Amino acid sequence: PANLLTSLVRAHLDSGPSTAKLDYSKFQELVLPHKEDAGDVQQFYDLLSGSLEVIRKWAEKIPGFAELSPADQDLLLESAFLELFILRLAYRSKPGEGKLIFCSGLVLHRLQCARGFGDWIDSILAFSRSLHSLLVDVPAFACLSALVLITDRHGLQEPRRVEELQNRIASCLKEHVAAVAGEPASCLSRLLGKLPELRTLCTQGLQRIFYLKLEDLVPPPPIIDKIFMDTLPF
């Protein structure tokens, strides 16, 4: 509980690259020069897709998660995807240097991403800089990300079990944020204050996917497309 914290930490660390598996072979801080094209849209989608399988395997190692109904599992994963992608990217990346680090280990400069992502990448970097100012340690991050996934959503079959699991992870976080600050609220409410901002960023991502689907240079991969279509409240 305790052991929960440890499970969450192990699941986080196993879901991303070792600082020795960082791939800088494509990184270029300088770019030449300039609307988006097909290679930029394909990379955007590819980056998005590479998190799918990683985040699904990460969730299965959250104790309690595999014991939710299968329909609630998928609804949670699908509804939280964009926000988890953003949160983990922001935490992993190095915004002081314009460096995006993706879950494969691939390192890219902000300018190598701008054309695909549009403005959204700047907003993600702003968020990253703000997340970095909190100096969120790994166990606290391991809880936060899990709280992004395990949260109320319209259409849950067992909303109370999801809440129960959310409460356990919240307690685990609260306790950890005390046992390291010296107990007895501020840090914690500043941390939890990152979740609504993350929703707002999820929306900017939906706008970018909309726009790209409008322009129709390359189709989105079917699973991303489904997430986009299923998370539209209309």
mmCIF file of C-alpha atoms in Angstrom:
data_model
loop_
_atom_site.group_PDB
_atom_site.id
_atom_site.type_symbol
_atom_site.label_atom_id
_atom_site.label_comp_id
_atom_site.label_asym_id
_atom_site.label_seq_id
_atom_site.Cartn_x
_atom_site.Cartn_y
_atom_site.Cartn_z
ATOM 1 C CA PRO A 1 0.000 0.000 0.000
ATOM 2 C CA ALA A 2 3.126 0.518 0.313
ATOM 3 C CA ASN A 3 3.449 -2.400 -2.041
ATOM 4 C CA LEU A 4 0.853 -0.508 -4.192
ATOM 5 C CA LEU A 5 3.240 2.451 -4.489
ATOM 6 C CA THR A 6 6.037 -0.003 -5.479
ATOM 7 C CA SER A 7 3.844 -1.677 -8.085
ATOM 8 C CA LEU A 8 2.926 1.681 -9.561
ATOM 9 C CA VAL A 9 6.623 2.677 -9.629
ATOM 10 C CA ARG A 10 7.672 -0.585 -11.300
ATOM 11 C CA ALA A 11 4.903 -0.187 -13.884
ATOM 12 C CA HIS A 12 5.927 3.372 -14.691
ATOM 13 C CA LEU A 13 9.663 2.638 -15.018
ATOM 14 C CA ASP A 14 9.107 -0.482 -17.167
ATOM 15 C CA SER A 15 6.916 1.479 -19.630
ATOM 16 C CA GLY A 16 9.590 3.873 -20.922
ATOM 17 C CA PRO A 17 13.161 3.815 -22.194
ATOM 18 C CA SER A 18 16.228 3.473 -20.046
ATOM 19 C CA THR A 19 18.424 6.562 -20.163
ATOM 20 C CA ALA A 20 20.759 4.084 -22.009
ATOM 21 C CA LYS A 21 18.086 3.324 -24.745
ATOM 22 C CA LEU A 22 17.704 6.924 -25.808
ATOM 23 C CA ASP A 23 18.000 7.177 -29.613
ATOM 24 C CA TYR A 24 19.457 10.428 -30.907
ATOM 25 C CA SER A 25 20.068 9.197 -34.499
ATOM 26 C CA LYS A 26 17.297 11.441 -35.931
ATOM 27 C CA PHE A 27 17.651 14.402 -33.628
ATOM 28 C CA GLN A 28 18.515 17.695 -35.402
ATOM 29 C CA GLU A 29 18.099 21.060 -33.599
ATOM 30 C CA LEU A 30 18.309 22.926 -36.914
ATOM 31 C CA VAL A 31 15.791 22.621 -39.724
ATOM 32 C CA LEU A 32 15.501 23.844 -43.244
ATOM 33 C CA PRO A 33 13.048 25.470 -43.914
ATOM 34 C CA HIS A 34 9.234 25.273 -43.653
ATOM 35 C CA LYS A 35 2.117 24.130 -44.475
ATOM 36 C CA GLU A 36 2.657 20.580 -43.090
ATOM 37 C CA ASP A 37 3.254 17.739 -45.547
ATOM 38 C CA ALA A 38 2.551 14.000 -45.633
ATOM 39 C CA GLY A 39 5.822 13.037 -43.879
ATOM 40 C CA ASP A 40 4.995 15.347 -40.984
ATOM 41 C CA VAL A 41 1.450 14.007 -40.636
ATOM 42 C CA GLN A 42 2.573 10.362 -40.850
ATOM 43 C CA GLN A 43 5.208 10.901 -38.116
ATOM 44 C CA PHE A 44 2.598 12.614 -35.846
ATOM 45 C CA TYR A 45 0.322 9.569 -36.172
ATOM 46 C CA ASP A 46 3.199 7.139 -35.811
ATOM 47 C CA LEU A 47 4.322 8.800 -32.583
ATOM 48 C CA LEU A 48 0.786 8.684 -31.256
ATOM 49 C CA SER A 49 0.464 4.985 -32.199
ATOM 50 C CA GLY A 50 3.711 3.905 -30.578
ATOM 51 C CA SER A 51 2.280 4.846 -27.167
ATOM 52 C CA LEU A 52 -0.851 2.600 -27.605
ATOM 53 C CA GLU A 53 0.638 -0.719 -26.838
ATOM 54 C CA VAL A 54 2.948 0.792 -24.218
ATOM 55 C CA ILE A 55 0.167 2.433 -22.258
ATOM 56 C CA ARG A 56 -2.048 -0.661 -22.498
ATOM 57 C CA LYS A 57 0.771 -2.817 -20.968
ATOM 58 C CA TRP A 58 1.407 -0.185 -18.318
ATOM 59 C CA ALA A 59 -2.288 -0.209 -17.257
ATOM 60 C CA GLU A 60 -2.417 -4.012 -16.946
ATOM 61 C CA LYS A 61 0.283 -3.716 -14.253
ATOM 62 C CA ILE A 62 -1.725 -1.282 -12.140
ATOM 63 C CA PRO A 63 -3.019 -3.573 -9.368
ATOM 64 C CA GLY A 64 -6.731 -3.547 -9.503
ATOM 65 C CA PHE A 65 -6.933 -2.457 -13.122
ATOM 66 C CA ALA A 66 -7.200 -5.935 -14.666
ATOM 67 C CA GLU A 67 -9.962 -6.629 -12.143
ATOM 68 C CA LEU A 68 -12.235 -3.974 -13.661
ATOM 69 C CA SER A 69 -14.692 -5.165 -16.260
ATOM 70 C CA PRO A 70 -13.130 -5.538 -19.737
ATOM 71 C CA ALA A 71 -15.531 -2.882 -21.134
ATOM 72 C CA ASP A 72 -14.523 -0.444 -18.391
ATOM 73 C CA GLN A 73 -10.852 -1.169 -19.027
ATOM 74 C CA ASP A 74 -11.194 -0.238 -22.690
ATOM 75 C CA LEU A 75 -13.353 2.796 -22.000
ATOM 76 C CA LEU A 76 -10.748 4.075 -19.456
ATOM 77 C CA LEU A 77 -7.791 3.425 -21.757
ATOM 78 C CA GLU A 78 -9.443 5.010 -24.747
ATOM 79 C CA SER A 79 -10.743 8.003 -22.854
ATOM 80 C CA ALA A 80 -7.342 8.728 -21.151
ATOM 81 C CA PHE A 81 -5.006 7.972 -24.063
ATOM 82 C CA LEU A 82 -4.351 11.500 -25.210
ATOM 83 C CA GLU A 83 -3.940 12.795 -21.724
ATOM 84 C CA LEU A 84 -1.536 10.004 -20.802
ATOM 85 C CA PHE A 85 0.454 10.488 -23.944
ATOM 86 C CA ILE A 86 0.782 14.206 -23.096
ATOM 87 C CA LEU A 87 1.575 13.686 -19.445
ATOM 88 C CA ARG A 88 4.229 11.072 -19.973
ATOM 89 C CA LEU A 89 5.751 12.959 -22.839
ATOM 90 C CA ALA A 90 5.868 16.205 -20.780
ATOM 91 C CA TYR A 91 7.443 14.478 -17.797
ATOM 92 C CA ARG A 92 9.977 12.603 -19.926
ATOM 93 C CA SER A 93 10.978 15.470 -22.129
ATOM 94 C CA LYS A 94 13.423 18.363 -21.564
ATOM 95 C CA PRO A 95 11.646 21.556 -22.335
ATOM 96 C CA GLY A 96 14.560 23.901 -21.408
ATOM 97 C CA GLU A 97 16.291 22.461 -24.448
ATOM 98 C CA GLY A 98 13.316 21.976 -26.770
ATOM 99 C CA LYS A 99 13.814 18.169 -26.521
ATOM 100 C CA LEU A 100 10.886 15.724 -26.913
ATOM 101 C CA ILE A 101 11.581 12.220 -25.732
ATOM 102 C CA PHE A 102 9.066 9.585 -26.875
ATOM 103 C CA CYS A 103 8.332 6.240 -25.153
ATOM 104 C CA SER A 104 10.328 4.262 -27.760
ATOM 105 C CA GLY A 105 13.418 6.327 -26.686
ATOM 106 C CA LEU A 106 13.331 8.395 -29.854
ATOM 107 C CA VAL A 107 14.555 11.959 -29.217
ATOM 108 C CA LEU A 108 13.347 14.851 -31.413
ATOM 109 C CA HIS A 109 13.637 18.620 -31.331
ATOM 110 C CA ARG A 110 10.526 20.746 -30.981
ATOM 111 C CA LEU A 111 11.082 22.126 -34.466
ATOM 112 C CA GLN A 112 11.193 18.664 -35.987
ATOM 113 C CA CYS A 113 7.676 18.218 -34.475
ATOM 114 C CA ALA A 114 6.041 21.583 -35.108
ATOM 115 C CA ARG A 115 4.719 20.852 -38.557
ATOM 116 C CA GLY A 116 2.928 17.655 -37.527
ATOM 117 C CA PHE A 117 1.672 18.715 -34.150
ATOM 118 C CA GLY A 118 1.096 22.463 -34.814
ATOM 119 C CA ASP A 119 0.794 24.830 -31.813
ATOM 120 C CA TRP A 120 -0.158 21.909 -29.616
ATOM 121 C CA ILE A 121 3.547 20.969 -29.128
ATOM 122 C CA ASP A 122 4.312 24.417 -27.732
ATOM 123 C CA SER A 123 1.474 24.048 -25.307
ATOM 124 C CA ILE A 124 2.711 20.631 -24.381
ATOM 125 C CA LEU A 125 6.176 22.167 -23.755
ATOM 126 C CA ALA A 126 4.711 24.934 -21.608
ATOM 127 C CA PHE A 127 3.010 22.227 -19.584
ATOM 128 C CA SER A 128 6.227 20.275 -19.384
ATOM 129 C CA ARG A 129 8.119 23.281 -18.020
ATOM 130 C CA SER A 130 5.375 23.809 -15.471
ATOM 131 C CA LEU A 131 5.354 20.103 -14.506
ATOM 132 C CA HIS A 132 9.175 20.267 -14.097
ATOM 133 C CA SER A 133 8.905 23.264 -11.702
ATOM 134 C CA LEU A 134 6.963 21.052 -9.293
ATOM 135 C CA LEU A 135 9.862 18.631 -9.075
ATOM 136 C CA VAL A 136 7.463 15.739 -9.088
ATOM 137 C CA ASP A 137 9.364 12.658 -7.942
ATOM 138 C CA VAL A 138 8.853 9.276 -9.590
ATOM 139 C CA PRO A 139 6.535 7.723 -6.995
ATOM 140 C CA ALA A 140 4.282 10.775 -7.082
ATOM 141 C CA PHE A 141 4.277 10.718 -10.873
ATOM 142 C CA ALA A 142 3.550 7.012 -10.827
ATOM 143 C CA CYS A 143 0.415 7.781 -8.842
ATOM 144 C CA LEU A 144 -0.654 10.833 -10.891
ATOM 145 C CA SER A 145 -0.566 9.071 -14.203
ATOM 146 C CA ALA A 146 -2.554 6.235 -12.808
ATOM 147 C CA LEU A 147 -5.105 8.747 -11.504
ATOM 148 C CA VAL A 148 -5.431 10.086 -15.033
ATOM 149 C CA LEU A 149 -6.462 6.622 -16.227
ATOM 150 C CA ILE A 150 -8.541 5.496 -13.251
ATOM 151 C CA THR A 151 -11.190 8.244 -13.133
ATOM 152 C CA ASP A 152 -14.887 8.650 -13.708
ATOM 153 C CA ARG A 153 -16.112 8.474 -17.324
ATOM 154 C CA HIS A 154 -19.578 8.491 -18.869
ATOM 155 C CA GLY A 155 -20.624 4.852 -19.585
ATOM 156 C CA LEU A 156 -18.718 2.961 -16.881
ATOM 157 C CA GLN A 157 -20.484 -0.300 -15.905
ATOM 158 C CA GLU A 158 -19.096 -0.148 -12.406
ATOM 159 C CA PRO A 159 -18.357 3.490 -11.595
ATOM 160 C CA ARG A 160 -18.059 2.696 -7.867
ATOM 161 C CA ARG A 161 -15.276 0.121 -8.384
ATOM 162 C CA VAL A 162 -13.395 2.629 -10.506
ATOM 163 C CA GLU A 163 -13.870 5.168 -7.747
ATOM 164 C CA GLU A 164 -12.694 2.636 -5.173
ATOM 165 C CA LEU A 165 -9.509 2.050 -7.151
ATOM 166 C CA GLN A 166 -9.072 5.808 -7.649
ATOM 167 C CA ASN A 167 -9.378 6.299 -3.861
ATOM 168 C CA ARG A 168 -6.704 3.711 -3.130
ATOM 169 C CA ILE A 169 -4.288 5.388 -5.529
ATOM 170 C CA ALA A 170 -5.159 8.850 -4.175
ATOM 171 C CA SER A 171 -4.445 7.649 -0.612
ATOM 172 C CA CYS A 172 -1.181 6.098 -1.736
ATOM 173 C CA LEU A 173 -0.199 9.433 -3.286
ATOM 174 C CA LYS A 174 -1.338 11.573 -0.256
ATOM 175 C CA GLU A 175 0.668 9.362 2.103
ATOM 176 C CA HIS A 176 3.787 9.481 -0.125
ATOM 177 C CA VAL A 177 3.548 13.289 -0.464
ATOM 178 C CA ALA A 178 3.585 13.470 3.360
ATOM 179 C CA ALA A 179 6.228 10.783 4.223
ATOM 180 C CA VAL A 180 8.754 12.730 2.103
ATOM 181 C CA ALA A 181 7.815 16.393 2.842
ATOM 182 C CA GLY A 182 7.567 15.729 6.621
ATOM 183 C CA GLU A 183 3.839 15.702 7.523
ATOM 184 C CA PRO A 184 1.146 16.647 8.621
ATOM 185 C CA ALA A 185 -2.091 19.941 1.154
ATOM 186 C CA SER A 186 -0.104 22.529 -0.772
ATOM 187 C CA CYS A 187 2.177 20.219 -2.802
ATOM 188 C CA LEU A 188 -0.720 17.823 -3.221
ATOM 189 C CA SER A 189 -3.301 20.371 -4.378
ATOM 190 C CA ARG A 190 -0.591 21.859 -6.699
ATOM 191 C CA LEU A 191 -0.047 18.373 -8.132
ATOM 192 C CA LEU A 192 -3.739 17.595 -8.541
ATOM 193 C CA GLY A 193 -4.076 21.022 -10.151
ATOM 194 C CA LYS A 194 -2.223 19.519 -13.116
ATOM 195 C CA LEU A 195 -5.111 17.240 -14.039
ATOM 196 C CA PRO A 196 -7.595 19.915 -15.285
ATOM 197 C CA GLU A 197 -4.806 21.561 -17.277
ATOM 198 C CA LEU A 198 -4.115 18.151 -18.870
ATOM 199 C CA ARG A 199 -7.776 17.884 -19.976
ATOM 200 C CA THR A 200 -7.527 21.274 -21.595
ATOM 201 C CA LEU A 201 -4.424 19.995 -23.512
ATOM 202 C CA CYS A 202 -6.312 16.764 -24.486
ATOM 203 C CA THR A 203 -8.760 19.100 -26.250
ATOM 204 C CA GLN A 204 -6.079 20.917 -28.236
ATOM 205 C CA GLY A 205 -4.992 17.449 -29.427
ATOM 206 C CA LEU A 206 -8.490 16.590 -30.518
ATOM 207 C CA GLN A 207 -8.485 19.913 -32.451
ATOM 208 C CA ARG A 208 -5.284 19.015 -34.206
ATOM 209 C CA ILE A 209 -6.580 15.572 -35.181
ATOM 210 C CA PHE A 210 -9.794 17.184 -36.415
ATOM 211 C CA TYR A 211 -7.845 19.615 -38.494
ATOM 212 C CA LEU A 212 -5.612 16.917 -39.944
ATOM 213 C CA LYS A 213 -8.656 14.779 -40.777
ATOM 214 C CA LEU A 214 -10.137 17.814 -42.529
ATOM 215 C CA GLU A 215 -7.050 18.310 -44.581
ATOM 216 C CA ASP A 216 -6.809 14.581 -45.241
ATOM 217 C CA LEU A 217 -3.124 14.319 -46.282
ATOM 218 C CA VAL A 218 -2.852 10.912 -44.688
ATOM 219 C CA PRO A 219 -5.588 9.029 -42.970
ATOM 220 C CA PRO A 220 -5.261 8.481 -39.264
ATOM 221 C CA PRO A 221 -4.514 4.939 -38.187
ATOM 222 C CA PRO A 222 -7.834 3.155 -37.402
ATOM 223 C CA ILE A 223 -7.326 2.859 -33.623
ATOM 224 C CA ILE A 224 -6.462 6.573 -33.236
ATOM 225 C CA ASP A 225 -9.415 7.386 -35.446
ATOM 226 C CA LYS A 226 -11.637 5.296 -33.217
ATOM 227 C CA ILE A 227 -10.400 7.012 -30.066
ATOM 228 C CA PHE A 228 -11.025 10.395 -31.715
ATOM 229 C CA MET A 229 -14.502 9.334 -32.875
ATOM 230 C CA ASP A 230 -15.438 7.652 -29.508
ATOM 231 C CA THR A 231 -14.272 10.509 -27.348
ATOM 232 C CA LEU A 232 -16.390 12.993 -29.280
ATOM 233 C CA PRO A 233 -19.434 13.798 -27.130
ATOM 234 C CA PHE A 234 -21.657 14.069 -30.306
#
